[PDB]
Amino acid sequence: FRTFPGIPKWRKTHLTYRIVNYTPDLPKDAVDSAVEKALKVWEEVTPLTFSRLYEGEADIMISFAVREHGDFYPFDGPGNVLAHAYAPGPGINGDAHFDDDEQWTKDTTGTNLFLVAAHEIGHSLGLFHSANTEALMYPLYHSLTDLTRFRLSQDDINGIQSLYGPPPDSPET
Amino acid sequence: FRTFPGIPKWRKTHLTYRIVNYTPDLPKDAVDSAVEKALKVWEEVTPLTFSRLYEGEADIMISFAVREHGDFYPFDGPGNVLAHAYAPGPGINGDAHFDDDEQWTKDTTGTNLFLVAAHEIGHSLGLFHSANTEALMYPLYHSLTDLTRFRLSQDDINGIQSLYGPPPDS
Ligand SMILES: COC(=O)[C@@H](NC(=O)CNC(=O)[C@H](CS)NCc1ccc(-c2ccccc2)cc1)C(C)C
Ligand SMILES: [Ca+2]
Ligand SMILES: [Ca+2]
Ligand SMILES: [Ca+2]
Ligand SMILES: [Ca+2]
Ligand SMILES: [Ca+2]
Ligand SMILES: [Ca+2]
Ligand SMILES: [Zn+2]
Ligand SMILES: [Zn+2]
Ligand SMILES: [Zn+2]
Ligand SMILES: [Zn+2]
Numbered sequence: 001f002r003t004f005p006g007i008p009k010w011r012k013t014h015l016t017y018r019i020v021n022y023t024p025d026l027p028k029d030a031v032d033s034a035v036e037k038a039l040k041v042w043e044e045v046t047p048l049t050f051s052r053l054y055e056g057e058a059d060i061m062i063s064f065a066v067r068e069h070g071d072f073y074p075f076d077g078p079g080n081v082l083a084h085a086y087a088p089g090p091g092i093n094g095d096a097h098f099d100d101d102e103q104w105t106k107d108t109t110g111t112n113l114f115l116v117a118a119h120e121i122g123h124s125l126g127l128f129h130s131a132n133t134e135a136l137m138y139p140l141y142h143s144l145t146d147l148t149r150f151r152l153s154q155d156d157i158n159g160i161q162s163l164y165g166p167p168p169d170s171p172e173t
Numbered sequence: 174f175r176t177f178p179g180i181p182k183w184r185k186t187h188l189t190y191r192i193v194n195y196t197p198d199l200p201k202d203a204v205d206s207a208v209e210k211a212l213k214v215w216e217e218v219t220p221l222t223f224s225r226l227y228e229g230e231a232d233i234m235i236s237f238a239v240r241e242h243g244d245f246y247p248f249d250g251p252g253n254v255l256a257h258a259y260a261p262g263p264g265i266n267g268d269a270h271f272d273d274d275e276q277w278t279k280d281t282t283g284t285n286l287f288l289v290a291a292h293e294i295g296h297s298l299g300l301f302h303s304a305n306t307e308a309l310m311y312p313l314y315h316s317l318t319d320l321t322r323f324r325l326s327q328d329d330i331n332g333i334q335s336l337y338g339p340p341p342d343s
Binding site: 019020021022023024027028054064065066067068069070074100 | 192193194195196197200201227237238239240241242243244247273
């Protein structure tokens with residue numbers, strides 16, 4: 001696993017997120033659920049908890065964007081870069097953006113929103129790309145029919161626990 | 174009425190539109206509806222026709238945005254600037270952006286999407302602001318329009334027709 005330079009990380013255990021805009025690709029409730037599910041992945045293996053805001057600045061601002069969108073890194077059209085997220089800190093830090101020139105889906109027929117969301121929130125929490133091919137934090141996406149049996153890899157757990165530790169409610173093997 | 178300088182206007186009657194993203198404030202069908210109704214206002218009194226695209230570059234790219242969003246004219250938080258649109262042309266020209274720091278509504282409890290969209294498309298089609306207080310293109314239309322009895326004023330019709338003519342075989 002790998003972190004960003006200086007290992008920036010949230011100094012709070014409860015983070016807020018806000019879904020700022022919605023893609024034409026899915027019904028609004030489907031976007032919400034993949035985001036909820038994506039956050040739940042990280043919540044299960046650390047002390048971190050998450051609540052949603054319907055207004056104001058949330059730690060993790062989530063949006064869909066096409067090409068130039070007000071930050072330093074314009075998206076790039078269909079394919080290639082799928083999304084990007086910023087390491088922990090104030091403002092644009094912690095936020096995640098999703099390229100709408102991608103067809104976001106609830107299954108693997110397009111680009112699975114849950115999977116990309118879980119991988120991006122991984123950056124939002126301070127994990128950089130993993131070299132481990134089995135990790136969620138691996139820089140390359142792959143269509144995996146298996147969304148019902150999704151499991152964080154041990155490399156991921158290790159990387160996120162090195163930052164925040166395990167859940168206070170769980171035993172350690 | 175008024176047109177932009179050098180009177181930029183579409184050189185074709187079939188214009189495509191695309192709703193690039195959706196606001197949290199309303200159900201997506203409410204957005205589609207209001208956008209369609211805004212387009213209809215103008216199509217009804219000209220030879221212009223519209224069709225929707227879900228991919229690629231449409232003439233009129235519609236989006237919601239907050240603060241800095243990829244153009245040189247950032248939105249300003251709640252109220253004041255509700256939205257902005259570019260006159261006819263290629264690329265960003267003809268596109269319309271809507272400030273999501275406003276609360277877009279179907280009715281008048283927030284900022285009415287239909288109304289603002291109708292004004293902005295007026296700009297996307299080549300109309301600049303009117304000096305007539307009753308016109309949709311009057312700068313203060315959003316504070317002066319009665320949505321129950323909404324109809325395009327004749328100053329708005331005179332202006333859009335000056336550019337594109339009346340509907341075929343009137
Ligand atoms: C083969 O896939 C790709 O290379 C795709 N592009 C990328 O992956 C480039 N990466 C990106 O644009 C962003 C940069 S933060 N990475 C998002 C991302 C999201 C999820 C996973 C993932 C990992 C393991 C299991 C399941 C999914 C991996 C990467 C597209 C060409 C389809
Ligand atoms: Ca942030
Ligand atoms: Ca892309
Ligand atoms: Ca899309
Ligand atoms: Ca355009
Ligand atoms: Ca505003
Ligand atoms: Ca809003
Ligand atoms: Zn971005
Ligand atoms: Zn990544
Ligand atoms: Zn703009
Ligand atoms: Zn105006």
